[PDB]
Amino acid sequence: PLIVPYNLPLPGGVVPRMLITILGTVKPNANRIALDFQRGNDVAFHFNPRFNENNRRVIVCNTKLDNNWGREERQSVFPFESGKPFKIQVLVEPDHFKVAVNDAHLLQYNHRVKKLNEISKLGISGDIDLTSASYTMI
């Protein structure tokens, strides 16, 4: 397994047709997971499954600019389960990140940070065993 938190460089940033794939297994009794597509200190796209927020499961997405979080986008469809292996696919499209989990479409997140070629790191954090993180062009 890879060391968590893990930093995957994205050389030259992201671009439409770039597909990022994360494989791992959620820990027992997991509380949270986060993917952070970063532009320097800014977080262009934070994808944050919460397993116990007031005894509810929710996916929170947001952007952090100049150290400030913006408006959250929340998805109640929650395809993760403690103890189970998962695949997250993030496909960069012209106007949004498109996310599928275990081959099922989950959500889209419109680009707030527009300099896609400057979003050149992916951080992976939280309560997982990380198997692999990689990218390819489709």
Ligand X SMILES: OC[C@H]1O[C@@H](SC[C@H](O)Cn2cc(-c3cccc(F)c3)nn2)[C@H](O)[C@@H](n2cc(-c3cccc(F)c3)nn2)[C@H]1O
Contact footprint for ligand X (CB under 6 A):
32-34, 46, 48, 60, 62, 69, 72, 125-126
24 is in an annotated binding site: no
- 24: Cβ contacts below 8 Å, ≥ 6 apart: 1, 85, 86, 128, 129, 130, 131, 132
* Cα–Cα distance list, 21 to 53, 87, 88 (Å): 26, 7, 6
Paired tokens of 49: 């499954």
56 is in an annotated binding site: no
Taking the complex as a whole, the smallest distance from the CB of residue 43 to ligand X amounts, in Å, to 9
Q: Which CB sits closer to ligand X, 60 or 65? A: 60
72 is in an annotated binding site: yes
70 is in an annotated binding site: yes
Taking the complex as a whole, the smallest distance from the CB of residue 68 to ligand X amounts, in Å, to 10
Taking the complex as a whole, the smallest distance from the CB of residue 74 to ligand X amounts, in Å, to 6
For 28-46, letters b (16+ CB in 10 Å) and e give: eebeebbbbbbbeebbbbb
Q: Which CB sits closer to ligand X, 28 or 94? A: 28
Q: Which residues are annotated as a binding site?
A: 69-75
Q: Which residues are annotated as a binding site for a beta-D-galactoside?
A: 69-75
